[PDB]
Amino acid sequence: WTGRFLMNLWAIFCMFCLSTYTANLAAVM
Amino acid sequence: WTGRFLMNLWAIFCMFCLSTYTANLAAVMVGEKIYEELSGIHDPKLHHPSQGFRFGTVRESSAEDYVRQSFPEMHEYMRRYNVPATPDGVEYLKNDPEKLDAFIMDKALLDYEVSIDADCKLLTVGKPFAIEGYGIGLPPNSPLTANISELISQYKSHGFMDMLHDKWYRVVPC
Amino acid sequence: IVTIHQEPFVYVKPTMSDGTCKEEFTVNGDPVKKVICTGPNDTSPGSPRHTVPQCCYGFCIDLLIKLARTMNFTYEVHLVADGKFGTQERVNNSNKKEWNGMMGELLSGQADMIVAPLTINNERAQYIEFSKPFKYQGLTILVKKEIPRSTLDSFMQPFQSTLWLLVGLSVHVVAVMLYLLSSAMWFSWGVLLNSSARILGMVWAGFAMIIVASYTANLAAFLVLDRPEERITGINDPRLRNPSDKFIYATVKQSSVDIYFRRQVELSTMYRHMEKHNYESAAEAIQAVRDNKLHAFIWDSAVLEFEASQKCDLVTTGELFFRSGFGIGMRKDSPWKQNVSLSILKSHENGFMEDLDKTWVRYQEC
Amino acid sequence: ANLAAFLVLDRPEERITGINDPRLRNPSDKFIYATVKQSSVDIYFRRQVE
Amino acid sequence: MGIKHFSGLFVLLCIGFGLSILTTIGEHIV
């Protein structure tokens, strides 16, 4: 599976990281 | 060449639009969710008219007398939108409440009307103010006052008042 | 009678052409009565030019009309040459400190009554006699209706403004370092837009993604703290308590507010700061505020609120500090002491005051 | 945006103001608050009918 | 880019540039 599962996992990780960074910045500010 | 610059400008505009939309949504989500935090009669919300508060009490109950004797301007301001009888005011709350959106009155009856309100679409707010008591009306300097006073005091002492209370004073989760 | 121009209490309308009074119909379309006035039609109290009669009506005038239909006394009305609400003042040879404006114009002894919204207070009641008040009020504060300038304006005003320069410099430095061509520049720009050598490219892509995420977070944080609108809590706001230059605030001269602040102790420097720019008329300060000249106009309730609800640019926020009631003035123990009080109280109970209030004080802004 | 707004809700409904509060005047089953049996506080809260 | 965050980002960028240069030199060696 070149992108059947690895791409989905990478997309989920990137979305989670972006959301976490946004939440951390909002809490800090 | 030039197409790359145009695409870069479009992408920059898209990023700016996305950031603006996110900021607008975040600001909007922090909007009215604890609305009508009146907290009592000392706040700019209810004291001077911010163009659209519609008060109201009973026409000449103890509410009207106390309000007119303490804070005068609100006497006129309520009296332009002041209802005559109690078992009408909350009914206007069901009239898409542009007419009535406040029914200042004794807290006990308000709590009862909240309890009977099965739909539970109303929430008493504001700290208690101007605490008073109740009694039995007698003519000036009439007799029998001491007997009835001591009788009711004894009934309170033995708990007959609480007997009547928990006989009638019910609670409903709201 | 002598009256001062105050809206929505008395209106000043010039006479049309020949000398007749223009007819007007109210919201109901019923006739609205008016009378003839004489005063300084020329200009502000400078050169006293012609004094052609004008048409007057409003809230006080019809009150006087009703008050006159009983006790049937014939009347003539004329404004005041000064234009100020009769406060105390000294002279260059101050040994009497007489009364200017309205009160002096009645106190000197050439007028009969005062029909105007003048606040009753202790020293006035000492020197002159009032009647039973027919309106209660307390002076609030107003300000412009904020500013809707937050529309894609802070392009480079998110506190620190070095964002674009830093991003461009870093991108240029990285591109120069990786240059070991136009295609390379386009690829580097795409790295900034998400349109050995491989390791360096991967590191640069990660750095660009991190920079983009950080910039988005910084923009969100900057555009999450734009909420302001202090709106002034009251006279106890420290920001106005300290006299500063960018938030000037004043009040009309020779009036009730000035005497109330100048006599009550509280403090002195606030009075000193306010006396610098105290205005000379009742309504021009509203135009100064609407322009941008003033940001806090301390003035009594009814007129301020009606003007605020008239033009949808001025609103009031506060707690309505201090309280008083408008009266109807008259000389010291005139033979008209009792009937005016009786009629005003009968009207107050009857509801006529409610009719007048609903007729001449209504809302259009919202 | 919604996740950021939800996470922004910090230290909510974790402090009590005073004797007068919607939580205090009407608990239902979950907010039991009590004191020690027939001590000085008990007769004070019973006495003042205010 | 508030003080500490900007300083950390710049330091990380410089360290990454140096490490990338060293890695490129090493790869060119072999």
Author numbering:
A (entry chain B): 740 to 768
B (entry chain D): 740 to 913
C (entry chain A): 400 to 579, 603 to 617, 628 to 798
D (entry chain C): 649 to 698
E (entry chain B): 926 to 955
Per the authors:
We next sought to determine the structure of GluN1a-3A NMDAR in complex with glycine, an agonist that binds to both the GluN1a and GluN3A LBDs. We hypothesized based on the electrophysiological observation that prolonged exposure to 1 mM glycine during protein purification would promote a desensitized state. The ATD heterodimers are also highly mobile and only weakly resolved, indicating that the high degree of ATD mobility of GluN3A-containing receptors occurs independently of ligand occupancy within the LBD layer. We could resolve additional density of the TMD compared to the CNQX-bound structure, which allowed unambiguous registering of the GluN3A M3′ and M4′ helices. Second, the glycine-bound structure of GluN1a-3A NMDAR exhibits a pronounced conformational change within the LBD heterotetramer where the GluN3A LBDs undergo ~80° clockwise rotation when viewed from the extracellular side. This robust GluN3A LBD rotation shift occurs around an axis orthogonal to the membrane plane. The inter-Glu776 distance in the glycine-bound GluN1a-3A NMDAR is substantially shorter (23.5 Å), and its orientation differs from others, indicating little or no tension in the LBD-M3′ linker. Consequently, the channel gates are closed in both glycine-bound and CNQX-bound GluN1a-3A NMDAR structures. We hypothesized that the unique subunit arrangement of the GluN1a-3A NMDAR bound to glycine could reflect a desensitized state. This inference arises from the observation that the LBD-M3′ loop tension is minimal, and the channel pore remains closed, despite the LBDs adopting the close-cleft conformation induced by glycine binding.
